[PDB]
Amino acid sequence: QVTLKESGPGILQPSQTLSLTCSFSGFSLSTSGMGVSWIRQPSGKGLEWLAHIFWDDDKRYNPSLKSRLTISKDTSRNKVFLKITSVDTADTATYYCARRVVATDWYFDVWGAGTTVTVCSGSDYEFLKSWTVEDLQKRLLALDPMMEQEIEEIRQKYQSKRQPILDAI
Amino acid sequence: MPIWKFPD
């Protein structure tokens, strides 16, 4: 079978460059007529096509984002790459890669499952260096109990969803 | 007619 897998940094501070990698198996991007697109779904919005690269290194870009995007490939490692410069909160999204094979129609026949990237909101580097170690350590250790309570709400919300099903079984 | 790149 044909598999595509997106990988990324997970989180990224604003103004940094996003480097995404699509690792694929089951075919060669050097085969005549193969190509791979990058696509994204921003938070609370619909899917958006970014760029496509063909077996012969021909590259096509979304004109609205062209000046920020760079698509590329390394067929010796079965990898397709995307670079997005100067990210902000509008680049928080799940990023997908998808294959298209030459045909009389034009469609993606196989997709990856996607990778989620969150562009971070607020954390000034110079501001945080000015913090003392105790202040930094206190804030860090305090972040754990809060995350756990947020996760537990999710777990309880989904345990109550399983109960009606588990009873009928 | 195959479409090798995009519809043109």
Add this chain to the structure above:
Amino acid sequence: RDIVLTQSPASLAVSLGQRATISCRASESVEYYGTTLMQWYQQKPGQPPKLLIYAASKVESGVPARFSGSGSGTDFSLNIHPVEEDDVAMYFCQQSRKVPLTFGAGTKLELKWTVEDLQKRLLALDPMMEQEIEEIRQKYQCKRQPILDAIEAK
């Protein structure tokens, strides 16, 4: 300039056994010399989108016969009949007539019984939970990593 795809409804609550219909209207024709470059995809939580329909009405291999596509020019529809548990999913249209490629904004198909269907529904809950927790984890890593990086620099 860009072809805009208007997909409706955003959300579809249906009863098991009924007909579901999803609509896509394009801002200009997606026809191209005897073929219509309109696709429909299905997406389950945490899974790769799956092609259902291409060239408006052609069914992809491995797609249940309950799915059909129709339409011409600018108006397209996906029809699911009868709706089954396995059809609870996100659906979206996609045009390939012009660059940039564009997508409909999506239809979330939800329901308003066999043990196989009930286990499928039970199993389907886990990737949704995992997705919600991962959003929480990434939100907090956004706050933790600047702090950890400040300590390491010191």
